[model samples]
Target: VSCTGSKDCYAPCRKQTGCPNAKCINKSCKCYGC
Candidate 1:
């Protein structure tokens, strides 16, 4: 699952994707399920 096309994935979007390990940088969301 992903959000905002995996772009601009800020804090809220992180939870939005059900991936708390997500980090938003440079207008992009990087998922860190680790």
Candidate 2:
């Protein structure tokens, strides 16, 4: 996902029940998925 910050990243990640921790790195959303 594309994101300007972690706040924007988490919106999409909340649905990901497995691993919802989100990071906005390099202006992109990276989730710690299991």
Candidate 3:
């Protein structure tokens, strides 16, 4: 899915899903600090 803003990327993921951090880059959600 494409993220319109950082808030959009923040809640949908967690550490168990390997997304310890959320960032909206290039209109997408990127998992960071894994």
Candidate 4:
């Protein structure tokens, strides 16, 4: 997803089928799925 200006974009993602693996930073939600 694109990084927006609001920090809410990096909210803690819940545990789901496609949840993020890494912490959010700099308005981006970094994850490890590959």
Candidate 5:
């Protein structure tokens, strides 16, 4: 997911998923599952 315009939208979406093995960077969710 990428937040090209709004950071606010990105924050809630990432938080909702819990982001297991991921972090929000540049308003995008990057995940690595192992």
Candidate 6:
């Protein structure tokens, strides 16, 4: 998914799951960390 940072795009995610940050991919959520 395109990003400025890994956040603010998960409301429509198929999983709708996140820890602290979120990203959208065909509206699907994934785990992210740095």
Deviation from truth (RMSD, Å), model 4: 5.6
Residue-wise C-alpha lDDT for candidate 2, range 1-34, written one tens digit per residue: 4577766767766666435566786556767773
Q: What range of 10 consecutive residues in model 5 has the weakest lDDT sum? A: 3-12
Model 2 TM: 0.51
Candidate 2 residue runs with Cα over 4 Å from true position: 18-20
Q: For candidate 4, lDDT tens digit of each residue in 1-34?
A: 5444334333434322234444455546554432
Candidate 6 least-lDDT 10 residues: 5-14
**Which candidate number would show the highest TM-score if scored against the true structure?**
2
Over the full model, what C-alpha lDDT does candidate 1 score relative to the true structure?
0.53
| Candidate numbers, best lDDT first, in rank order | 2, 3, 1, 5, 6, 4
What tens-digit string does per-residue lDDT give for candidate 1 at 1-34?
3445444454555555556545555555676643
**TM-score, per-candidate, Cα-based:** 0.26, 0.51, 0.43, 0.27, 0.28, 0.26
Task: Write the residue-wise lDDT of candidate 3 on 1-34 in tens digits.
Answer: 6776656676655532656567776656766645
How badly does each model clash, as a count of residue pairs? 0, 0, 0, 0, 0, 0
Query: Over 4 Å off in model 1, which ranges?
Result: 1-18
| Number of the top-ranking candidate, with lDDT as the measure | 2
> Which residue ranges in model 6 land beyond 4 Å of their true spot?
1-18
lDDT of 6 at 12: 29
Clashing residue pairs found in predicted model 2: none
Query: How far off is residue 6 in model 5, in Å?
Result: 3.6
Cα misplacement distance, residue 28 of candidate 2 (Å): 2.7
Clashes of 1: 0
